[PDB]
Amino acid sequence: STGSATTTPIDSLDDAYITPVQIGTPAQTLNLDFDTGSSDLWVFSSETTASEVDGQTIYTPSKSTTAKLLSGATWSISYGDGSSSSGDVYTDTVSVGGLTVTGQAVESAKKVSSSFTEDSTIDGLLGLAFSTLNTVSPTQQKTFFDNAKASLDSPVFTADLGYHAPGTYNFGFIDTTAYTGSITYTAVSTKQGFWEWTSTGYAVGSGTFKSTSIDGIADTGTTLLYLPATVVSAYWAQVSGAKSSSSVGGYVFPCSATLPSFTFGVGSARIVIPGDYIDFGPISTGSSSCFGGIQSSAGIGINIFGDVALKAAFVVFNGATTPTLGFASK
């Protein structure tokens, strides 16, 4: 089997991408944030505290003839940005782009943190990291991809995120028309539960490539590119007037600037992020200070190849017995 679904930016900045997911019988379609940095499929629901729902579409398990309460199971998650959610668990039929999994754990939120409530466009998350990170207790549950894998034509999914435009998540096949050149594959460590890999270096604009190992994660659920402070300083030094602002929370730059590209290495291959992809717009409405799309990871503990980096590539998440990642230009 295969599946193919379009993923759409939630706003004009590409802050996140939403993908329609069918849950239950009859189908209830919710728009979920596919997140290769986490491993829970959780949704706003008829059980979510009413004051914490503000415009999201909810899953109502009592209206699904295939929903079954997973007795005794609870979940609770906290994300790298400080947001969180928790609740109970159903199993139900879940379909993405024509690919159907029966008995998928659907984690129904009883509580969500304010940042979720305040974002009316995201109805929940669909985790695509390794199932070892799933938070369901006392019986950990499998991700949608883990449940589908054995049925897929090939045990892979691909992320093709658009810049200021829709893109595609495919399951079970590699669309050879969706990229240019060849796909360069690189090793993955699953020791932390992430799609963790090592970039071979970087360049700023037309500058020389610096060969240096940068360990990080491929994370579709993170907006920006978070890299070591040395790398980030080298980038922003090429933008007149750019500076790190403690009060804003990162590097800012004059909105009048033209940003240089940023290149990262995948083995001997190179992925070029155009400068425009690094502009996240005014820090507040009407400001002439703009927020940068490349930020320091120093306070995170891990480097993160988020959407800024991934949307410059066609990315293969190869879930074979020994997982690997693939990157192609497009």
From Swiss-Prot:
**Active site per UniProt:** D35, S199
Amino-acid biosynthesis among the record's keywords? no
Q: Which residues of the full protein are shown?
A: 90 to 419 of 419
TM spans, by residue? none
Highest rank taxon of the organism: Eukaryota
Q: Which residues form a coiled coil?
A: none
Which protein is depicted? Endothiapepsin
User: Member of which family?
Assistant: Belongs to the peptidase A1 family.
Supply the alphabetized keyword list. Aspartyl protease, Disulfide bond, Hydrolase, Protease, Signal, Zymogen
If you read the UniProt record, what top EC class would you report for this enzyme, in one word? hydrolase
Q: Which GO BP annotation is one of this protein's?
A: proteolysis
Q: Which reaction does it catalyse?
A: Hydrolysis of proteins with specificity similar to that of pepsin A, prefers hydrophobic residues at P1 and P1', but does not cleave 14-Ala-|-Leu-15 in the B chain of insulin or Z-Glu-Tyr. Clots milk
Spell out the disulfide connections. Answer: C255-C290
The enzyme's E.C. designation: 3.4.23.22
Which species expresses this protein natively? Cryphonectria parasitica
Q: Which GO terms describe its molecular function?
A: aspartic-type endopeptidase activity
What are the residue boundaries of the Peptidase A1 domain, all occurrences included? 17-328
